[PDB]
Design a binder for this molecule. Sequence first.
Ligand SMILES: Nc1ncnc2c1c(I)cn2[C@@H]1O[C@H](CO)[C@@H](O)[C@H]1O
Ligand code: NI
Length: 329
Amino acid sequence: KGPVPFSHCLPTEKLQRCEKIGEGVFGEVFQTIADHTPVAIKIIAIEGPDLVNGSHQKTFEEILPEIIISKELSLLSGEVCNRTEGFIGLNSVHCVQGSYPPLLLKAWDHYNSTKGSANDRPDFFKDDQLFIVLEFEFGGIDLEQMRTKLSSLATAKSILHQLTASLAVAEASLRFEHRDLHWGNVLLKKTSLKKLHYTLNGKSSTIPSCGLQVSIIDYTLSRLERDGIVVFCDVSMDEDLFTGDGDYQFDIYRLMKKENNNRWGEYHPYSNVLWLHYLTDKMLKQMTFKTKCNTPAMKQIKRKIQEFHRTMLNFSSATDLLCQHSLFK
Ligand SMILES: Nc1ncnc2c1c(I)cn2[C@@H]1O[C@H](CO)[C@@H](O)[C@H]1O
Ligand code: NI
């Protein structure tokens, strides 16, 4: 069929409603609306020779793993033996050709003016430029942006339980490792559901929501397999990924490399445990809650999360944590 114009993914009204909500070296994320329903659109330049945000563009072969993994994890919401809604829904993926839409540059400029951007203004692409455009379910607001917005550490527990269950179901179905689950990649949306449902190897359970539904995003470094065919990002020769400082996040990259002896095709679900430890550490050290722990039952939740923090690295996988850790009994 070949690539499509941007107007195929963003017809005029949908384009006019785009607001920028996120960014990374990879590119840009916009929110818009269609059929009365919000969506997030991730746009990644590929195949061209220009540096973009300081880095070379991925080839189609390099971007395919993220595409494949986004699809696999979305599909878990509709499976039976291993089912979870804890990964973001993927609506569509397109290969688009053209220069960047002026209306998106307008949205880009607004974000730059109010929040500031680390990125280049994407106005230098020619009409032959290719992009991958991934349209996802709108998952809410990332944990990092919610640093001061959550009600209490009770919510922290539901968040950790949801994250652990999702990762476990993906481990079980797909031998999945996220590999980059920093707090910008944990999204929180209000839900009126009191309990959320998952199924792990045929056994269904529930998790009290505390009014929030968690969605895990961004599969740029992720790994999984089906029928022994492994899909992953080979970072064995990457330099910069392992030389970060100033946040426990950057230790996780080094700790993953220690665990897997720099062999990124292998399955080491302990990496999911390391990420969950990093997220628990954020809950205890960087998040700040509108209400502190002030009742017996709540000073106890705090103690339980602290216990989790100091014991969870002795578990082999998110599956082991979910099934064996006292926090989830
Ligand atoms: N599906 C979504 N729903 C809501 N927000 C999303 C997404 C996606 I894909 C990304 N983002 C926001 O974009 C920031 C950088 O990826 C992320 O940190 C997050 O702030
Ligand atoms: Ni289409």
